[PDB]
Amino acid sequence: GHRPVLVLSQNTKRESGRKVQSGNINAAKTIADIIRTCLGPKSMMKMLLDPMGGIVMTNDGNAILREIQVQHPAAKSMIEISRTQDEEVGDGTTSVIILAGEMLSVAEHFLEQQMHPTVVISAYRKALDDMISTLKKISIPVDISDSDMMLNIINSSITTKAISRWSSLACNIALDAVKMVQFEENGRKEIDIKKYARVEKIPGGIIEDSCVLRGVMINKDVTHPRMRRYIKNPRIVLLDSSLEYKKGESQTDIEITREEDFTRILQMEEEYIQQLCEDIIQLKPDVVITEKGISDLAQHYLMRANITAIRRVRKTDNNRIARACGARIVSRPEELREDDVGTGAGLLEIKKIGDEYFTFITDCKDPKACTILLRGASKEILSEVERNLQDAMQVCRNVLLDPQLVPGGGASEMAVAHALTEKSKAMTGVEQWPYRAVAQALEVIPRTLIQNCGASTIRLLTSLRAKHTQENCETWGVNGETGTLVDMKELGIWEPLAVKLQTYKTAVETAVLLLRIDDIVSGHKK
Amino acid sequence: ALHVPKAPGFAQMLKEGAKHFSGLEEAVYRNIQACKELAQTTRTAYGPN
Amino acid sequence: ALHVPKAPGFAQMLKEGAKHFSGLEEAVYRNIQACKELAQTTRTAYGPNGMNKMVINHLEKLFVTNDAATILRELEVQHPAAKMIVMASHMQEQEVGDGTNFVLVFAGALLELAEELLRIGLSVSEVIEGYEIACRKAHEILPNLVCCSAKNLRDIDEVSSLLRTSIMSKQYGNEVFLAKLIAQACVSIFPDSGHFNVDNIRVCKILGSGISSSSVLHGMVFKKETEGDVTSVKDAKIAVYSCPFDGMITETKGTVLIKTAEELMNFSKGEENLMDAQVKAIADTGANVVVTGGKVADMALHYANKYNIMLVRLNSKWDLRRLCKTVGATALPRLTPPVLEEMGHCDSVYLSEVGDTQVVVFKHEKEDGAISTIVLRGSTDNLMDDIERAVDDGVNTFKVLTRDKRLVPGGGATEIELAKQITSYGETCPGLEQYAIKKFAEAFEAIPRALAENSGVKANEVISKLYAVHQEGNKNVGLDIEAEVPAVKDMLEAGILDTYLGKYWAIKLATNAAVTVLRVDQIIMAKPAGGPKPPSGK
Amino acid sequence: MMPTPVILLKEGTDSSQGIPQLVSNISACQVIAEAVRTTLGPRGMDKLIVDGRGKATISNDGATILKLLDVVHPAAKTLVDIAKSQDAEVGDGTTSVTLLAAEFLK
Amino acid sequence: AAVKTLNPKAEVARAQAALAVNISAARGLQDVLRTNLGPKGTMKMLVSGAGDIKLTKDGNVLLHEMQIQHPTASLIAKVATAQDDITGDGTTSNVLIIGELLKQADLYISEGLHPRIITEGFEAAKEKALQFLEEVKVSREMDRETLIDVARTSLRTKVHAELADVLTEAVVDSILAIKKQDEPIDLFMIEIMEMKHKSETDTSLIRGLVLDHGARHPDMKKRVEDAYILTCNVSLEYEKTEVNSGFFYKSAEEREKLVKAERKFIEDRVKKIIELKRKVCGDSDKGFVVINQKGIDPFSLDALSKEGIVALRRAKRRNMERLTLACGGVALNSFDDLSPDCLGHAGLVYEYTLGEEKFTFIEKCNNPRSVTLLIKGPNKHTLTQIKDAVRDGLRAVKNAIDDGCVVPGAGAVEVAMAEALIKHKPSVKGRAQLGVQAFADALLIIPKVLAQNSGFDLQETLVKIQAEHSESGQLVGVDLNTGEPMVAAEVGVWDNYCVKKQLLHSCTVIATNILLVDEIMRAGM
Amino acid sequence: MAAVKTLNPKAEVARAQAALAVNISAARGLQDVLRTNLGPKGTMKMLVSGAGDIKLTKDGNVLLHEMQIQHPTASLIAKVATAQDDITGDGTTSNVLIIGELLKQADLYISEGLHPRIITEGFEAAKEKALQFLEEVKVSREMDRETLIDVARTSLRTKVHAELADVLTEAVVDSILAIKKQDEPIDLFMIEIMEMKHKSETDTSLIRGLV
């Protein structure tokens, strides 16, 4: 007996000092090294295995980082910033990880030289402000009306993915989907591709057959075979209330003492269904879409008026149909109005693809929602294609909202590094050394591009730096496929300004956050 | 689709407890890190102070 | 240098408990060996001199019989090839009703000779092609081997003679008595319309008095007692109800709402008067026997006793339908009195005791009716079960005779003649198919060989004598089991004959199973699972 | 015998055939008949059988004694079955049947 | 390993290890599936954990039934599953081509060549191969003979000879029966039934429907000559009120009245049916058959049988459309507007009893747009194998009809395509010529495997066929009986053009994606 | 599974293509590891024993012995390399590489249905022709000090650092010329190799005597 007395509970570990800082920096460096090789047009894909048996073959940095599990909290912070970068701008998820890793790597050198982390953080913040200034200074304007330049931007965004083979088709698909999704109401601009740009994947066929529809496509069939599977100009009526007979909310109970009351009640059920269907029919529609069930008697009464009904559609799909065909979802058909009838859908077709029936509401005139029908080799290939298309659409939206561009292929990195180094000469305090350190740590992107291309890093990077020491050479980067220095005015690889700004901000702030940390404590319960 | 088998060749023929490290990252950087750790361990005893 | 690693490729990719067998030696010979083992296990029960086998299944239920299909059903067969051959045997049992042992023996012989042919150098495809050609030749030859026809099915003695052979293989000691019983039961069934239903022959097993005391009854026997006090009716006018013998109730919900004392005092009296009126209305039609499929209310039983109506309750609806067919009644869905067309008539219904169990007998006096029953006596339940299996074989033989009336000689005579003719045919066919054809012909020797082995004589002498006599030109000469030395006799006069359809289907199914087993080249067995049986079989 | 990588019947299946099997069956029938030998005749004796629950049953009746015994030998159960049959059909002679059957086999 | 420093319980393959693992898995899969290709391939027995037996040589079925837990095997299996889902054929060829592509690519990668060059060569070779396939396809009018030839080319590879011929006749007849001019073919209108009582060659085509259930009332007629078909989706059994009614009475007479009056609703619909039957046919010459998707309680069954009406209940949902297209009536969800024109017509309806289950036959239709194939066999595995074979045949015939072009088979198209790729190789700039050569050699696997399965030698047969094609220019394939070069078009060995296009696209895409993988990770725990 | 597994249940058997695949995979793995040893531009390997002894080597035989392998084909190839080292003292890495590449090239044709016997016959014919050509191409020359220096350099440069190799060349050539009798076999037992642990690696030299 006589158990020992403790201040803190058992299994409450505590680590402190230089060890914590070194461990955090090494964890960030390892996380960066995981996806270091997945950058640039020459990137090699990774094959991930899910705990549930799935396989994720991907080149995207965010997917790779979110599909792995770590226990070191600094690695968790790196995964979190990767997810943040993915959610905010859409791409740049591996560039930000690499930049943050390099910034922490160059901060460790000063942390080992009797320099307080607060000084390094102040220098990093000044450097980040100057990077923002330089990036805004070297940007170029873009007119969104020129579709060719938008296609070129999307191409430069997707040349690093597995879809670069069909880059032209992918760019056209992404541009059309983003343009259709774009919408404005009550003076509020809106580009919501998360809800109104649906990507549907059906394995088989060829990827060249994939296209974006002027409408929607749902995996649904007619409730009854007699209903038409092909209508030219359907007047769509949308519903979100069941077309059956349902119990009321209140505690209702009947008490039958006469012979004819039972049959009378059943007849009233039938008559209620008939009246409901008559109220629907009064608008003279062609197809009826419901989110809830449709009774067989209701189907009969609708087919009596030559109406096609689809029984149970999801909420999001019904919203997409409403956006595409200009309808308005209603619940009580006695309150149905003419404005709620969806006219604008140019055709409704229900054809069988493989062994499944699919409903097409294509051919809409000016639809505000679209379905991207992807056909390919298998589910993993189509998942990667969907991720690449998501990157393309996010880049298109970023350019549409913010129309500036900055040179790619490491040209922006070298230009900002040179500007930061030149400005660092004016400083006379001790903060200049970490300032220059992060400035040259920004050079990791061209170095990684050269390494992935397979060329010699030292001489190519030295020549690139020497070129950037000149006056009008801020657009000089590296070819990702031939390993030579070229002017990005000629290569045409440009990136949205917003993506670069977000990448730099996230990298510097992650470096600051992990530099502020000491005295790791673990083990306690909730 | 839940396990990664050992690559055919040397990886499969290796003994049970044996360890194999090859390349820059697996070998050279690890050795440099170990030597740096040793130097850091003994550093504070240098000099009259 | 102390361990052999798994070869790269499929061997390393295979699961833990899985097994993979590929190639001739590793797959085909193993399958042939398993099938030969199964055939050898069942072999000793073939023919009249076959020996019964005590088989105890996983539920400690004892089966003693020489029926090959039953033995294979109660055996926990694990090998997939043996499973395939068992499936073929069961298909033969379902299609015809007899010949399962023939199927198993022929398949085993075919597979053994196929292994021999593969060993001497033939290919699997060549063996399969030769087997198919020889099977076609056998099916062509078979109609020419028909010796006599049934030529009558409403007779008693002639059909009994026809069915004696089918139930001589089982119960060899006393087959004339069983043949007479089954013949009478089947002749009562099978009206002027050519359709014969096997289900119409019922078997009720009552223990105690030895199988020689068994009898056939024109009607149905139910092992239970009457609900009422009347236990015998001489001019039964049975009315059959598929509804419980009780006041009909609402399907929705019942609730007696009482608001005055008068209703409370009068409710039970009115209900009693109503049920009495219903029972009296039923009795006024003349129905002195009532059969119900549901429960019997106490007031219902009281009022039926008051009006002298015999009550019989049948829990199983199959028995209710069979009784309706037997008497000629219709199952009333309600408790309304039956009209004259729906009221069945039976010449005698009474409660009786046979041995120990109480029985209710719906007995007709005519030698006709839709359903006939064979009551089997005996000293053991297992013996009665075996007699029931023999009765099933006899009834199936009668059904086959109704379908096709052609017959072939038994006791290996047909097999020997088929082997001789197929060998003669294969002696002329050039190419490598001749070896397979000759082996297919030789595989027919397994039937007379098994018969001679079970009889306890030398098989080789019997087969040589059979070939000698058949070469002389006697196609109806086969093994004589009533001798202590190898001897043969003409079996058209002996009356030992087999159905043509039985032999045809048995040959077809055995050859199909053999060639299907031969076609398999690789086996990929998954890890065995201890699941609570597949949901399909419940 | 041989290992037979894939065996025919389920593992654990026991098979006995030939003259030894039938001789053992006869011996089991003799053993069953020995359990009711002393219950026959005016000088017969009673048997006491205790079940798992501890309740004892005292009987001179052959069928009852055979029923109480938890016989599991497949050939021996035939004697119990014929004793039950004799009791059901006639009601007397439940010991003579078993003695006669075992004596025939012997 | 960097990953193992974060998650110690991780399995990682990097750089050459990933390629070695993937190529080894693909080679193993190809080694197993080599024996399926061609009519001379070998059957496989697949025993499940529960002991069920299957006898198939399909690539997709075999892949599903292997006991494999490899990631690359899973990827190839999903590719083959998509192949089977869309085109319905060409899964074994898919796996073989993927494996041979990976092997040929490794043959150059192991000598220091980067996989990206191989992938570029693969893309160029795929483009050229698609152009050549466009140039070589044989546009034809899909008469009965061409469809029979295609059906033979599939079913002979799936089953043995005479069974294949019977299945070809049945499949071609059924497809031609349900086909509408200038209209997509709906394969749901061919119902596939399995009965387990006769030989495998008894499978035939019934110009009507076969329903696995029959009349549940014994008094119902077992055979109706001239039948009026009523396809309905109306419940004819007792239905509880939705609002919890319950009954309240004060005497036995009131209870009897309420019992009698609670059936009035269903009795009204039964009376409507009986009135329609009496109006339509006033004598016993014609018959009435009611096929209901919902249940029928015994009282309604008895009421219908008293009028000589055959009633079926709990029919399959697809049977509504199938009977509407075959019999020609209309499926009704209510009887309120019941008209004589709503009744389909069938020239014969009878019930067949097999064991404990009964089947209903609806034959002698006027012009059935929906027919059924009745699979018959003595075993369950035989039935499953025949079902898979007829699925393959139906897909092949539908694909042949869909586009008026068909491609010569027996490996001829692959040989000619490889020759064209070799000729085009010098035009490709850079070292992608190595990838083009690898693609051509991978394409040459089909004649090699066909020669192997036929029992010949790969090299001699392949060089003979290639020399014949170069000398003559014809599309010469592999003769599986003699091994000599042979013209596939003249003998009638046809392959689906869409199947070959899908093969090229999927194989190239999956090989390119696998070759570019340099790391395999399992760190989700 | 097989006959052996039937007689001995706990027997490991690889039959037909399985054995060939196993042997070729083992040879390919050995070749893959030993590729980096060949040539003066090869890479050093660090071998750590169970007791913790550190051994830096580039020799093929030394690498094979301190390999942690339990493969039969690896054992066979290691024994062949051991014999090569015992007799000639050089060529172990080349031995392993040539064996592995021969097996790989043979498999390249065997995997296409060709029987290995034809490959072995071709191997024998090619070996005879190659031996004839090697006889044709050899350079007969009287061995002065310069040629021996060149040979010693060609070996030691591939074994050790270039400057250390240059020192060792003079050491070994001088020792061999010192102990060499005229037209008599050279007894290498007369060159004692004594190691001391107090100077730099370039301080090794030759003593015209005995230590």
Ligand SMILES: Nc1ncnc2c1ncn2[C@@H]1O[C@H](COP(=O)(O)OP(=O)(O)O)[C@@H](O)[C@H]1O
């Ligand atoms: N054709 C090209 N030549 C050189 N560099 C390129 C080219 N295309 C893209 N890049 C560079 O590759 C990077 C994009 O790589 P990617 O894998 O998309 O990383 P992220 O996911 O962080 O955007 C960009 O920084 C861009 O500068």
Ligand SMILES: Nc1ncnc2c1ncn2[C@@H]1O[C@H](COP(=O)(O)OP(=O)(O)O)[C@@H](O)[C@H]1O
């Ligand atoms: N009295 C007899 N003499 C000789 N052979 C007989 C006699 N009775 C029947 N057989 C033979 O016995 C065989 C029947 O064997 P059986 O045990 O019934 O197997 P199965 O039930 O599979 O037909 C028939 O082929 C028949 O030729």
Ligand SMILES: Nc1ncnc2c1ncn2[C@@H]1O[C@H](COP(=O)(O)OP(=O)(O)O)[C@@H](O)[C@H]1O
């Ligand atoms: N009678 C024949 N003669 C020659 N070649 C044939 C014949 N029948 C089929 N083939 C060829 O053999 C191949 C059969 O492949 P198959 O087993 O059907 O694989 P899958 O089912 O994956 O398509 C086809 O590519 C076809 O060209």
Ligand SMILES: [Mg+2]
């Ligand atoms: Mg990007």
Ligand SMILES: [Mg+2]
């Ligand atoms: Mg029999």
Ligand SMILES: [Mg+2]
């Ligand atoms: Mg096919």
Ligand SMILES: [Mg+2]
């Ligand atoms: Mg050397």
